[PDB]
Nucleic acid binder design. Sequence first.
DNA 1: TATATATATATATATATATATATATATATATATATATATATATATATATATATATATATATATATATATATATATATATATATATAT
Length: 128
Amino acid sequence: SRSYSQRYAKWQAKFNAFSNPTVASTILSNVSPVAQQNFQTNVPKFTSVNENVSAVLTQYGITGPNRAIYQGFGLKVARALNRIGSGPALVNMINGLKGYYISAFNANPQVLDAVVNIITGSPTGYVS
DNA sequence: TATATATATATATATATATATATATATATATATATATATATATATATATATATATATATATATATATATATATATATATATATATAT
């Protein structure tokens, strides 16, 4: 276990280390092509979500930051999908997620279902 | 010891020719400048008057696009760390 004093102390030491020209460049240049792979591998998956969800939002007349609300929701759905996969667990996730957005951010349930209807292909609850 | 010839100089006497300068007298031509008088042309600037075009900036008014940051609101992805929980 670690107290704040300890949390910070070590954080500082590592931050300092990293800031060193040679340390930063050593690490970053070594993980360059690796990171590139990872970025390329997963990012396109979410871009397509942003696109399709955007299309939906335009059909629903959603503008400004309100689009951003639903986009965040959609992205979250996709995230869970990637880290969990479709089926039961995803259903459990989406149900809670909807509750989160509906009541915490006053997102419109109906539109939220429209978002799910794209990413998953249908509203949740039932697997299909 | 003298004389002669051939070259390298210096002088005594004047003259001539050829080059390198300086002056006395004016004029002419050709170049390198400076001025007196105006005008013209061509370039290098500065100003008086406005306008136009092209570039280098600053602002007044809003909007748009492209990059460099900071924040407001959440979410996502990718990397750099710290922790909460176990493996």
